[PDB]
Every structure is written in structure tokens, then in C-alpha cells.
UniProtKB/Swiss-Prot annotation, chain B:
The gene is nosL. This is Copper-binding lipoprotein NosL. The chain holds residues 24 to 174 of 190 of the full protein. Belongs to the NosL family. Monomer. GO terms for molecular function: metal ion binding. It comes from the Bacteria. GO terms for cellular component: plasma membrane.
Curated annotation (Swiss-Prot), chain C:
Its main location: membrane. Belongs to the ABC transporter superfamily. The gene is nosF. The keyword Cell membrane applies. CDD domains: ABC_DR_subfamily_A. This is Probable ABC transporter ATP-binding protein NosF. It comes from Stutzerimonas stutzeri. InterPro entries: AAA+_ATPase (IPR003593), ABC_transporter-like_ATP-bd (IPR003439), ABC_transporter-like_CS (IPR017871), ABC_Transporter_VariousFunc (IPR051782), P-loop_NTPase (IPR027417).
From Swiss-Prot, chain E:
This is Probable ABC transporter permease protein NosY. Induction: Induced in response to denitrifying conditions. Activation requires NosR and DnrD regulators. GO terms for cellular component: plasma membrane. It comes from Stutzerimonas stutzeri (Pseudomonas stutzeri). Keywords: Cell inner membrane, Cell membrane, Membrane, Transmembrane, Transmembrane helix, Transport. It holds the Pfam family ABC2_membrane_2. The gene is nosY.
Swiss-Prot record, chain F:
GO terms for molecular function: ATP binding; ATP hydrolysis activity. It is found in: Cell inner membrane. This is Probable ABC transporter ATP-binding protein NosF. SUPFAM superfamilies: P-loop containing nucleoside triphosphate hydrolases. Transmembrane segments: none annotated. Keywords: ATP-binding, Cell inner membrane, Cell membrane, Hydrolase, Membrane, Nucleotide-binding, Transport. It comes from the Bacteria. Inhibited by AMP-PNP. Partially inhibited by N-ethylmaleimide, orthovanadate and NaN(3).
């Protein structure tokens, strides 16, 4: 299968990005430095780690794959790759596997070094709950990153230049992290007669950063729908990216 | 229709029981004379040992925005030592008298009425002044309770 | 057997036809040249040969199949112009990436890095490569496997003057084996020594197809004979002008003959018979001059004294 | 209702002093003469379960060393263990053990009664609505209730309209309210210990009183509740680990206008101090807010200085410095943000409380002080613990 | 003059940057929004320390967005090697870029604090118009100087590097270090030492950060409360007057331009 | 005598990347500089522009100093690849260069019409092709009557009608008295337009002179082929009587490599029997001359397909 032969390229090309390795070092330091000030000062520190990994795992995903399609069109290899025995689906799905295992490794250096500072500096952490609360944390942090990876394929395939792709990747990162919940707060504190607050637990499902926190904070909905709603955010946006990539 | 259906549950007031703690002072409500306010919220009913302790709760800024119906007793149709549960008027459209020598539960004695002449009956019989719900503020509650249980 | 059989396609985008009535047949070992100026027909024809587009009013038969079969593209090299590969990857790892996709054997990567002369700069990043160093890498992925058709869109841009002539010696080694390739260049002297048959095309149509001996025969273009001191300038200016040829009156000791190549068979006997041929330069009408003629044959009024 | 003279008291001294020997008895008993009766330690005066067991109607009686058992439970007729009439002035009730389902010590209208050193174990099965009070005091002036041990009664030491009396050194365990105060003007209570209680200290409508040195270990949902107290004094109280059962508040100030709240220690609760909107501008300086998950809950927009004479409180989450070596800190400490009161004003923000936008909005307040609502700040907070002795 | 002929290009090149005109209008719509909250709260020393905090985040940002690709964006673009074959020097195509990009920041803050003054003189009734013009005159001729510091910082990190993708990483590093990391290392040095590291050296560390010298100039008159300053409360322990704080802001330009010229002279 | 390089042996890093080049350029000639292994091609380019200092030797541009501003207004440099300023327009880029070089502002509208860019004038440079930027890069080189052009590959990324018209525009400037240097790597095509080539390799300037001189100083076979010959079998042998191997590769493609010592009698063999149609005296071109002088210094001939 050629979905893996193009995946081994993106592993070797993504891991030599100095922009990515700078952020993954700062993510791994700040996950320890919050856990250091969360132990001396475990659900109380995994919520502050959830707000940390909502800042940077969309930022890591948009740093990797904002120039995945349009960066190859500017490089000229995109027109070359379509003349190979390769579909347009196998290029996108193979870049999604290759960029996916990068931030599936960036939480294993991110939270793999954070759990070392928790299991060895608390002395009574009751580690049987740790390997289920961090197994739920490391898996759901990749799925948060895989949404914004599929968001990055949507904005890369739409644009025609690399400079306006970074202008949209900053726009997607601002809108889905800290504009959607600030306009939820402004719809609370300024509107109450025409804003039903019972509707607001369902309006959090239109935001994958919000669905990320709800499966790290354990609510009218169960947990298993939020796992199926986070995976639905991958599956529509990848299918949306495949529909955009077929119109170049 | 959503606002009306939520109204269609909040409007009814629950009758007081012997095992009813106040929301603020937490002690048993029916061991006291005087009218007893309560607050129906439509997500959970909270009750108060006195009407002055209910109005002290209402003037806090957590509950200014809270759409919740306030219900007090009608002391124009009840004996003051043992108020029943039958007639429980809306607290916004009442006529509280102030400054009487009657012994309420927690705050100042605020006998609630609905007909304003029986409110004028108790005002001249004890030296008080009738006043509406919207004139009640926190400069008046602390002034009137200091004149009742002070000196 | 013909590699590319473009059989009467007419490619349009909306109402405008960017490529109208193109009819090519590339042979089994021929080197063909797609040259275009006003039209975007050159670029669209490239896409039609590959699997990038579809013929909206015709059909293409690349290697006897449709151009988008996987059996076609495993034996089809394509070097695009101005390509810049993945700069954090190395030179060996980039070709090892491209060998995995085309299904070529991994024992051919170290051969083709040696074949294009990239052994010294292998295992270095593509960001620390020159422009012509990336053209050696871009040529090397086209030679992966056993290709039967190459589309070299501008292969010698930014390349060293030894390596361009070494590239065309690799071309004539390839076309002897039987892989008919296509040159797509814009520096017309240099491609003209190795092109088997030109395919100059205008805005819409295909202007002329055939070898250089057929283009010079059809388009009547005058020979550019320049000499230096055969007998004398003024004694030799007079002779070609009654026979119907232009004799340019230069400054001193130079005989420029622009003859019309129709009566000059027996006229050249007198030039040998009265003097020595020891310093002459006969220039045939070049591929640059033929291409400028076909732009004047359909469109494109000539620029001024020196304008464009 | 029999009398105390109907028993067999062996007189140790002929000054109306009697001594009941070891051996059990039965029924209610009544004191009508000023007898300073003592008891042997085996004097188990066990009533049958009805009526007030040891009713007292005579003044100046030093009841000492008796052990009462199983009196009545009718709280409406006030079936106590030790009923003390208004005519029974200056009674001493010393070192007694009581076990029965009603009032332990019911006094009313008395002066200078001394309730010293008793151990009153109330009940186990009654639903804390009919257990009766441990030491009920009803409008007494001059009382001295000292160093008792009340366990498992209803609402502990209830006090109703009693003016001048001291509550010194008594341990109150496993009850609903620790000390209940109703309209007790000019009261006092020192060094009391309250354990595992649904409200540690009820301060309802009692003015001008001194609350000093008290300790509250592991109470439920209310550390010290003060309703409508004026001109009071809260100095040296140690409130520790108010667990939920309310969410757990170490001090709940409700409509208290003037009181001096100094040198306290509010430790390991969910809320360190709850200040309502009606209770403002009172001297709160010198306390220790250590280990609480949220220090101040103050839902207002009015500014509230919490430092009299330039000295503030010690805060555990005070990340400040002190360059000039005095005891005071250099930067002021706001305990509450603007988004820390959106959680209290609107409970739907609890879903958004872990969002980065809330964490953005906490940083915008520290950079842009125009959006800061005027809160509950204190200039010059303390750097070290002032209550170094209260931890014992 | 040749220094002005290359300034007219950069004045006409920064004004076509759409990324500048977005975030310089963001400086205008926030300086109205901050001054509108400063009128509804009346408050006066809080709207001065918040406007100076707004220009701490944006006037380095507009300066580093302009000039991070000033030299290295011309070197790899090919148009720098051509420019030295014109009748110019290396000192004229740097000082000319400093004049050309400097007037953009002189217009990006005249728009920002200009419309902020009209959201005060037309909003709070009875304000002192003499004190308003003096306070916003000190805000205008000192936020340019903060902008001209980071303009001269950007010429240092453009002459040193040889790739524009690495210049944007370093310009983001300079913006993070001087704005909101130097304020946090100095805070953590005071918290973890409990203010007993050095009781006299630590106020002099405010002069090693031009964003903090910018805050110390505008917070001279309106000290007001104590919690409005935060980490700027060490500026009361600084014995230098206000005029040296202007000259220490001008010295941050002149050393970081002579460093930028000596780097560019051996490019 | 426009460019007078004398005795220059440029050293940097104690490497000596240039050595003893004496490159005098005439006042109307079109010189060509071609460099392969040697870095002389770029260092000498710089040396004439004045942005480099000649260690151990002197460069005299226009008879004066190379870094004077009075001679730098009379130069024109087209660099390798100049994506100029993508947000500026076409006129605004060229008016910017007109203000720097001191040229009159009446030249800017008549240089965007002299070069074929008036239809794409007042349009942003990000919407330009590579060929249109080479058109714009030429437009600042002809700014304010330059007496010395210096073009670094001016015809790359350019369509062939504009390429042929560029050399006609060069041929206008040669008659005006302006010396032009055409430094290129695309050597077939520039040999018809230059007057003197200068192949420099491994630092040392190997060969200089006109194209007629470089074929005289290098014994290379002249390739007479007569395409469309009547008879072919005796034409395989009839040229070898005076030592000219008549080797062919097609039905009639006899590319007779001669010796340049019997040019009268081989054409007397050709014209005495058999009629020609279009004789092709293929001189050893600038591509073929370059690989002789390169091989004469350091280079060894590469293998069968090994570059
Ligand atoms: Cu009470
Ligand atoms: Mg300090
Ligand atoms: Zn109550």
C-alpha cells in the first residue's frame, strides 16, 4: 500500500522541522512545570493540563500541516506526485497518517515526561487510577490534534499560496480556541431573555476544543457520545478535505 | 412555549413541612412565628425562616438576575403565631409593614399583607409604616432590624 | 508503435478553447519539442499527455492505453520545471521516497545518484543545494525504473555547461534503447541539435510538425552565409544580387550572403572556382528563426528596432 | 414527682449538705430546699424515661457528682435532666454524667448559675429534631457555663436572649449546631472546641459579644455562621477543614455590619470566607487564609479594603515579595478575578471554566486594569503566619 | 538625498501590507475600547496603565512585522545585491529603512492614540483638556520610541540571519522575551527569593527591558493605587528621574542601531 | 576600454579563488564570461560592480575607480533572479530605481513601453511571471543611459520571441557605444551575439579572444555535413583521401569531421562530382569549445551516461 510509502516521508520531514521541535520542547517543559506546581502547591492538575494541551495541540497540528498541500504545490511536487501511480485520496490519507503519528508521538514525549514527574514526585499518587486517567488523556489529546490536522488540510487545499495559508491557520486557531467560547460568554452575560442556557450544553458540541475538555472532566450528554462526536469531527473534515483536494 | 412550560412548574408553591431547614440560617423553619418566605426556582425550591431573611437573600447580586418566584404568607388571613400553607401570596405584590414589636424569626418583623388596609391596621396599631416590595433595600433592612432587636 | 497518440483533441475550460484541434503522433524513439508562446496550449498538451487533465473533445492514447492507468505511469518519467523538493529531507532519502512510490527497486537509488553525478552531495539537505543541483535530482527521479516516455519540461535551466551536453548524451543513449522522450524548452539553440522533430504550436492550433529538414523545406527561409576575405568585399557584393540574393554592404573585408536557397546549387560552384573557402560560416535557418517565422505566420506583428 | 429528701442521703456536714451513697434510684426528683448535695461516683439516679429527672426550685444549690440516666423526651413540656426554675438562683451543677433523649441542662430566668465540668451524651437514634438541647439557656443574666462535654444532642449549647455569660473551654462533639446564639446581647465565649458538626458556631442576632480562641475541627458545611451580629469581636478563632455535606465555608458573614475580625485561622476548607453583599465595611485584618481552595467569595462590585492600620492578612496563594524588610507585603492582593465571579453569578460558566479563553481572561485582567471590577483587595498583606500558636 | 528616496519606498510598501493594517486598526479599536471603559468607570490611573499595556503588546508587534524581513527579505529576494550597485552606501539603505518604517509607526500610533483622545474628550464630561493633551502627548512621543526600539531590534536579527523563515522565528523570540518573559523571570526571581536576592540591584534590572522603561515613563504622574503597577512597583525604588528614562529609551535605539549597522557592514 | 582588470589575484580565507586575470574589455565589444568549476565567474562579476575589494590587483571600470558614485550611475546590473517587491506596482518599482540612479523621470514611462510591459504596468509584482520580472529587471538596467551593461543570465525563464528581441535591443546598445557583459550558462545561443568569449576555470582565465581566434588556438574538427545528398556509398569513402572520416548516422547524415587543412580540395571533391542542396559547415560551437578548454585545465572526460 502506497499510503505508507508516502507516510514514511512525512515522518522524516516533520521530525526535522525546527519550528515543530521548538514547540514540542516547550510543550514538554510546561507540562512538567505545571505538574511541578500542581504537586507541591490529580484531577486538579489534569484539568490545568487540559487547558494547556488545548493551547498547543491545535497549534502543533496547524504548524505541521498548514503547508501540506499548498506547500507541495508551491514546491512543484504536487503536480509531480499526481503523475505517479497514486490517487488523490492516498496522498491526503498518507499525509494524515504521517502527520498524525507525529503529534501522536508529541503527546508521548509531552505527557510521557509529565507522568514521570507525577508518578515519582507525589508518593501516594495511587497509580492504578493514573494509567486510566492518562490513557484517557493521551488518546483524547491525539484526537483533538487530529481534528485540527484535518482542519489544516481543508485550509491548505482551498488556498493557492503559502502566505495566505498561514493567515487562515492563525484564523482557525483563534476561532476554535478562544473566540468561540468568548462569544459564548458574551452571549451569556449580555443576553439572558433570548439565550436559553439549557441549550448551551449542546452548543459545546460545535467546538472540538470544548468536546476535548468534556472527556477530561469526568452534563446531560454521556461520555460515549462525545467520543463519537470527536471522531465525527475527524470524519467530516477529512471528507471535506478530500472533497476540496479533488477540485484543484 | 419553552418559557411558559418552565413557568407552569415554578408558579406552584410547595407547602412547608416540619423537617424544613432555612436556606440561610439552616434551622427548623416551623419552630417560629411570623410569615415565612420561600423561593421557587423551577430547578429546586429553597425556603426561608423569615421574610426578612428571604429579602436579605433576594438583594444579593447572585439572585438579582435569577428568574425565580418569591412567595410569602398572607398575614391578613392568618393568625400570626401559626401561619398556614393555604394562602401564600406573591411577594412582589405584597404590602410589608415594618417596625412593629412582633417577634419574627431572624430579621426585622416584616408582616406581609395583600389588601393594604389590614396592612394599614397593623401600622397604626404599632407605630409602623407600610411599604412596597420595590422600596425594600439593604439600607432599610439593617436599619429596621437594629431598631427591633437593639437597645 | 507510437508512444503518444493525441488524436484530434480540443481542450476547453469554459467557452474559450485553450487548445484547439491538436493532432500529434510521437514515434517509438523520437525526440519531440512542444514550443509555445501566446497560447497556453503547450502547458495544456503536457497535462493531457499525463493523467492530470481529461480531453474534453477528443482522446489520448499514451502507450496504447489511457494515460491514467497505473501500468502506464510506472514507465513514465516526468521532470517538471522549477521544482523545489522537500528541503529538510536528504538527497538520498528523497529518491528513496520516489523509488517506493513508482515501485522501482531500491538497488537503483545508488546507481541513479551516481548516474546523474550527485554522489558527493548525497546525504545533504535539499535546502543546501543549488538550482542546477536540484535539476540533477529532478532528472534522477524520472529515470526510476524502465521508463518508456519522458516529459522533460525545461531540463537544462540553471545547469552547468558540461552537464547540459552530458544530459543530451544521456538522451541519445536513452533513445537508442527505445524510450521516446519529449523535450520542452525555451532556449531554442541547444535543443536544436538533439530534437528529432519539432512541434511548434500557436495560440490555438498546431502550426507545424516534422523534422528540421521538413520545416526548412516548407517554410522558405534564407540561408545566412557569412565569409571573411574570399577575394574582396565589393567584387563579391555584385554577383549574388542579379541572381536574386541580398548582399549586405559591411565596412571592410566581409562578405555576407543571404541567398534564397533555390538557385544556389550551381551558383556555389563559382565561389569555389575563384577563391578559397578557408574562412566562411554557412548558417542554416535555425530553430530560433523558424519559430519566429511561425509566430509571424499566425499572429504576432513584429516588434520595433529594438523593443521586446 | 417525688423529692430529693425522699431518698436516703447520708449527711457529711451539717450545713444543709447531703451525700447520696452508691446505689441506683428511680423516678423524677425535686429540690425545694437550699441543699448543697454531693454524690458518690456510684450514684446512678436513673429515671424511668418520663418527666424532668432532677428538677430544681431552690436557690444556691451545689449539685455535684451525680449521674443521671434516661429522663423524658417531651421537648414541649421541657422534659430535661436538670430543670432549673427562675427561683433557683446561683445553682452549681458540677461534674455530672447524663444520658437521655431530652434536654440536658434546661435553665430559664436564672442568675449566676454555674454549669461546670459535666459530660452530657445525648442520643444515637433520634433524627436530630427531637434529641433536645445539650445546655439550654433561656434568658439568663450572669451564667457561667465552663468546661463541659456535650455529645450527640440537638444544636449543642442553645442560648436564647441571655445577656451576660461565659462559655469557657467546653468540648462539643457530633451534634447539629455547636453553639447556638439567639438575641444574646453582650455575650462571651472562650476556647471552645467543636468537632464534626453541621454548623460550628451559630451567631444569630446577638450583638456586642466576644468570640475568642475557639477551635472547630472537621465541621460540615459551615465553620462559623454569623447572622446579624453588630459590634462583635472575632479574635483568635481556629477554623479547620470545613468539609462539604453548603460546599463548606469556614466563615459565613451574613448581614453583620460592625465587628472586628482579627488573628483568625481559616484552614483547608472549600471556601475561606463568604462575605454577603449586605455585610460590608468591617475591620478584617490579621487572619490566616491557608490551604483553602477559594479564599474569598464576594459577589459585588463595591471595593472592600481588608486592612485596618496598614496591616492586612496572610494569604497562602499570595505570590508577592517584600523588599523593605517589614512584616507587610509590597503589592496588594486581589483574591477574586472578574471571571471568578462569573462562575458565581452564572452557573453555566462552570462548563467553560477549563477553557483557554477563561485562562486568557485571567491574564487580560493582570495586564489591563480597566476591566477589573472593584473587589475585596487588601493593601499590605502579611508575609508570615501571625497565628503560630493557634495550631495546637 | 538618497536616504529619503528609499524611505519613500518603505512608506509605500508598509502601507500595502494587509497584515499591518489589520493589527494597526486593532490598535485603534482597542484604544477606543479601553478609553470607553475608562469613561464609564468615572479610573484615571487605570486607563493610563492599560493604554501603556496595550502599546506594549502591539507597538513591538507592528515594528517586528515591518522590519524582520528588511535586509534578509531583500538579500534572498535578490534586490539587495542589486541595490549596492546603485549610488548608495550600506549606511543609507539601513537608516533610510529606519526612517521609512519609522514613519509608519509614527502613523500607526497617531491613529491609535489620536482616536483614543476623541473617545475621551467626547465621552467624559469636564476632563482637563490641558492635562489630556499633555498625557496623550507623552503617550505619542514615547510609543514611537518604543516602536523605534523594536524597529532597531529587527534590523539586528535581519542582518544576522540568512533565511527569512528563520528570521520570523527569531523575531517571535524577541517579541516573547522582551514583552512577557522578562516580566515573568523578574517576577519569579522576586517570588522564589521572597524579595531577598538583592534589595538594591533589582530595581536597576528594569532598565534592561525597553518595554518596562516605556511603562515607567507614562506611569510617572498617575501612580494612583498600588496594584495598578504590579511588577512596576520596583520603579519607585529607582532613583533616576524621568529625564534619564527618556535618555535610556533613546540609548536603547542608538546602541541597537549601531549594532545593526556594524552587522550589516560585514554582511 | 570600459573594464580594465589588471593583475587581480583575489584571495579570501587564504584560498586564492582567483588568479592573475588580465581582462581588458573594449569600448564597443560584447564580452562573455562562462564559469564551471571555478568560482571566478561570480567573483569577477562582483569585482567589476565595485562591491568587492581586489586583493593584490586593481580593477579599473570606465578608466576610474570601481566604487565611485560617478561611474556607478553609468552601470546596469541584471542579477540572477530578482523577485523585486511583491506589493509594489510595476511603475512604482521602476520609479524607485529611477530616483536612486539619478535618471530623469521621463524615462520610466518610455522604458515600460520599450520593454514589453506596458500592458502589465500598474500591476503588482506578485502577479508577474518569471519572464515578466526579467523584463522588469532589464528595465532598471537601461536606466539613465548606461555606458556599461552587466547582465547575469538575462534570458532565463524567457519566451523565445522576447529572447531574440532582447539581443536586437543589445545590438542597438552596441552601436551606441556601450560595452555589454553577458555572463551565462546557457552557451548555445549566446555565441551568435558576443564578440569575444572569456572561458575562465579554476580561477585562472584560461582562454580569451573572439570566436574565430578560439577555434584557431584549439584544433577541433569542423563538421561539414551535406544533408540531402544524391549518392551515399562513394560519399562514405571519397572524403577520406585527404584524411576526413565521412561518418554518417542516418540515410544521409554524413557529418564529415575535417582537419582544417584541406578545405579547398574536399569541396572540390564535393562540387566536382555530385550536386549539394544545403551544405552545413558546422563550426565547433561555443558548447564544444568550452569542453576543450575545461578539459585542458583540470577536467577529465566523463563516462557514457554518467552526468
Ligand atoms: Cu437560630
Ligand atoms: Mg515586596
Ligand atoms: Zn431562616
Amino acid at each position: 500500500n502506497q499510503v505508507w510509502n508516502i507516510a514514511r516521508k512525512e515522518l522524516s520531514d516533520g521530525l526535522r522541522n525546527r519550528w515543530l521541535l521548538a514547540i514540542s520542547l516547550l510543550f514538554a517543559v510546561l507540562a512538567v512545570g505545571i505538574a511541578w506546581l500542581g504537586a507541591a502547591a490529580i484531577p486538579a492538575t489534569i484539568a490545568s493540563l487540559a487547558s494547556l494541551a488545548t493551547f498547543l495541540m491545535p497549534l502543533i497540528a496547524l504548524l505541521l500541516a498548514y503547508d501540506a498541500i499548498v506547500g507541495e504545490d508551491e514546491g512543484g511536487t504536487l503536480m509531480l506526485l499526481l503523475t505517479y501511480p497514486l490517487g488523490r485520496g492516498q496522498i491526503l490519507l498518507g499525509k494524515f497518517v504521517g502527520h498524525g503519528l507525529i503529534l501522536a508521538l508529541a503527546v508521548l514525549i509531552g505527557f510521557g515526561c509529565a507522568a514521570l514527574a507525577i508518578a515519582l514526585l507525589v508518593e501516594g499518587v495511587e497509580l492504578g487510577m493514573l494509567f486510566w486517567a492518562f490513557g484517557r488523556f493521551m488518546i483524547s489529546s491525539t484526537l483533538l490534534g487530529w481534528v485540527f490536522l484535518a482542519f489544516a488540510y481543508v485550509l491548505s487545499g482551498k488556498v493557492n499560496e503559502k502566505s495566505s495559508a498561514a493567515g487562515l491557520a492563525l484564523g482557525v486557531w483563534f476561532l476554535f480556541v478562544l473566540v468561540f467560547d468568548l462569544v459564548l460568554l458574551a452571549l451569556l452575560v449580555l443576553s439572558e431573555g433570548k439565550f436559553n442556557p439549557e441549550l448551551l450544553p449542546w452548543l459545546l458540541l460545535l467546538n472540538p476544543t470544548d468536546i476535548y475538555r468534556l472527556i477530561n472532566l469526568s452534563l446531560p450528554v454521556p461520555a460515549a457520545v462525545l467520543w463519537l462526536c470527536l471522531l465525527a469531527w475527524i470524519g467530516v473534515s477529512l471528507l471535506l478535505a478530500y472533497a476540496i483536494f479533488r477540485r484543484r | 412555549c419553552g418559557e411558559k412550560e418552565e413557568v407552569q412548574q415554578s408558579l406552584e408553591p410547595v407547602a412547608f413541612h416540619d423537617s424544613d431547614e432555612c436556606h440561610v440560617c439552616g434551622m427548623i423553619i416551623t419552630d417560629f412565628p411570623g410569615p415565612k418566605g420561600q423561593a421557587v426556582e423551577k430547578r429546586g425550591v429553597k425556603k426561608f425562616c423569615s421574610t426578612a431573611e428571604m429579602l436579605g437573600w433576594w438583594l444579593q447580586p447572585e439572585n438579582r438576575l435569577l428568574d425565580a418566584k418569591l412567595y410569602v404568607h398572607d398575614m391578613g388571613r392568618s393568625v400570626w403565631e401559626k401561619p398556614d400553607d393555604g394562602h401564600l401570596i406573591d411577594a412582589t405584590s405584597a404590602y410589608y409593614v415594618v417596625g412593629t414589636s412582633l417577634k419574627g424569626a431572624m430579621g426585622a418583623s416584616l408582616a406581609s399583607f395583600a389588601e393594604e388596609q389590614d396592612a394599614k391596621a397593623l401600622a397604626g396599631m404599632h407605630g409602623g409604616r407600610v411599604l412596597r416590595f420595590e422600596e425594600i433595600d439593604q439600607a432599610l433592612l439593617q436599619e429596621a432590624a437594629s431598631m427591633q432587636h437593639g437597645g | 508503435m507510437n508512444a503518444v497518440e493525441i488524436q484530434g483533441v480540443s481542450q476547453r475550460y469554459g467557452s474559450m478553447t485553450v487548445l484547439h484541434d491538436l493532432n500529434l503522433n510521437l514515434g517509438e524513439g523520437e525526440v519531440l519539442g512542444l514550443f509555445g508562446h501566446n497560447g497556453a496550449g503547450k502547458t495544456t498538451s503536457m497535462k493531457l499527455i499525463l493523467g492530470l487533465l481529461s480531453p474534453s473533445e477528443g482522446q489520448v492514447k499514451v502507450l496504447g492505453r489511457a494515460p491514467n492507468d497505473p501500468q502506464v505511469r510506472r514507465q513514465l518519467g516526468y521532470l517538471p520545471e522549477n521544482v523545489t523538493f522537500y528541503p529538510q529531507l536528504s538527497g538520498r532519502e528523497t529518491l528513496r521516497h520516489f523509488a517506493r512510490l513508482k515501485g522501482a527497486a531500491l538497488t537503483q537509488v545508488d546507481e541513479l545518484l551516481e548516474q546523474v553525478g550527485l554522489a558527493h552531495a548525497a546525504d545533504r539537505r535539499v535546502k543546501t543545494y543549488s538550482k542546477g543541483m536540484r535539476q540533477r535530482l529532478g532528472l534522477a527521479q524520472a529515470l526510476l525504473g524502465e521508463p518508456r516516455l519522458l516529459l522533460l519540461d525545461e531540463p537544462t535551466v540553471g545547469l552547468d555547461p558540461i552537464a547540459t551536453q552530458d544530459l543530451y548524451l544521456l538522451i541519445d543513449r536513452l533513445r537508442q534503447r527505445g524510450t521516446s522522450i519529449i523535450l520542452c524548452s525555451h532556449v531554442l539553440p541547444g535543443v536544436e541539435a538533439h530534437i528529432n522533430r519539432a512541434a511548434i504550436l500557436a495560440k490555438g492550433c498546431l502550426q507545424a510538425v516534422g523534422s528540421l529538414s521538413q520545416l526548412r523545406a516548407e517554410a522558405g527561409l534564407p540561408v545566412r552565409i557569412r565569409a571573411s576575405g574570399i577575394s574582396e568585399r565589393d567584387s563579391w557584393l555584385q554577383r549574388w544580387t542579379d541572381a536574386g540574393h541580398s548582399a549586405r554592404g559591411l565596412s571592410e573585408s566581409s562578405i555576407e550572403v543571404v541567398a534564397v536557397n533555390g538557385h544556389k546549387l550551381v551558383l556555389l560552384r563559382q565561389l569555389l572556382g575563384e577563391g578559397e573557402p578557408e574562412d566562411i560560416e554557412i548558417h542554416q535557418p535555425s530553430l530560433e528563426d523558424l519559430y519566429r517565422y511561425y509566430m509571424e505566420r499566425a499572429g504576432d506583428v513584429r516588434a520595433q528596432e529594438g523593443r521586446l | 414527682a417525688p423529692q430529693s429528701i425522699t431518698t436516703l442521703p447520708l449527711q457529711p456536714d451539717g450545713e444543709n449538705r447531703w451525700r447520696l451513697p452508691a446505689g441506683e434510684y428511680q423516678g423524677q426528683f425535686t429540690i425545694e430546699q437550699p441543699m448543697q448535695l454531693r454524690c458518690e461516683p456510684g450514684a446512678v439516679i436513673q429515671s424511668q424515661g418520663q418527666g424532668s429527672s432532677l428538677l430544681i426550685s431552690a436557690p444556691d444549690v451545689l449539685v455535684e457528682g451525680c449521674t443521671l440516666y434516661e429522663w423524658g423526651s417531651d421537648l414541649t413540656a421541657m422534659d430535661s435532666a436538670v430543670f432549673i426554675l427562675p427561683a433557683a438562683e446561683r445553682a452549681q451543677i458540677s461534674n455530672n454524667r447524663m444520658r437521655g433523649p431530652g434536654f440536658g441542662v434546661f435553665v430559664d430566668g436564672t442568675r449566676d448559675v454555674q454549669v461546670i465540668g459535666n459530660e452530657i451524651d445525648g442520643d444515637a437514634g433520634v433524627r436530630s429534631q427531637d434529641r433536645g438541647n445539650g445546655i439550654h439557656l433561656f434568658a439568663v443574666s450572669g451564667a457561667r457555663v465552663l468546661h463541659n462535654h456535650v455529645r450527640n444532642a440537638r444544636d449543642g449549647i442553645y442560648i436564647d436572649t441571655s445577656n451576660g455569660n461565659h462559655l469557657e473551654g467546653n468540648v462539643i462533639e457530633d451534634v447539629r449546631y455547636g453553639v447556638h446564639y439567639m438575641f444574646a446581647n453582650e455575650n462571651s465565649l472562650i476556647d471552645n472546641v467543636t468537632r464534626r458538626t453541621r454548623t460550628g458556631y451559630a451567631l444569630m442576632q446577638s450583638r456586642k459579644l466576644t468570640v475568642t480562641g475557639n477551635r472547630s475541627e472537621q465541621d460540615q458545611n459551615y465553620g462559623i455562621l454569623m447572622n446579624y451580629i453588630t459590634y462583635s469581636t472575632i479574635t483568635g478563632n481556629f477554623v479547620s477543614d470545613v468539609q462539604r455535606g453548603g460546599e463548606g465555608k469556614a466563615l459565613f458573614i451574613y448581614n453583620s455590619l460592625f465587628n472586628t475580625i482579627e488573628n483568625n485561622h481559616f484552614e483547608k476548607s472549600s471556601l475561606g470566607i463568604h462575605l454577603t453583599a449586605g455585610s460590608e465595611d468591617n475591620r478584617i485584618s490579621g487572619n490566616a487564609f491557608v490551604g483553602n481552595q477559594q479564599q474569598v467569595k464576594y459577589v459585588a462590585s463595591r471595593t472592600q479594603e481588608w486592612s485596618v492600620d496598614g496591616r492586612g492578612n496572610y494569604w497562602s496563594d499570595y505570590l508577592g515579595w517584600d523588599r523593605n524588610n517589614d512584616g507587610l507585603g509590597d503589592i496588594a492582593y486581589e483574591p477574586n478575578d472578574n471571571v471568578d465571579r462569573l462562575l458565581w453569578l452564572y452557573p453555566q460558566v462552570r462548563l467553560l471554566m477549563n477553557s483557554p479563553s477563561i485562562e486568557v481572561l485571567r491574564w487580560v485582567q493582570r495586564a489591563f486594569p480597566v476591566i477589573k471590577s472593584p473587589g475585596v483587595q487588601d493593601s499590605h498583606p502579611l508575609m508570615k503566619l501571625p497565628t503560630e500558636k493557634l495550631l495546637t
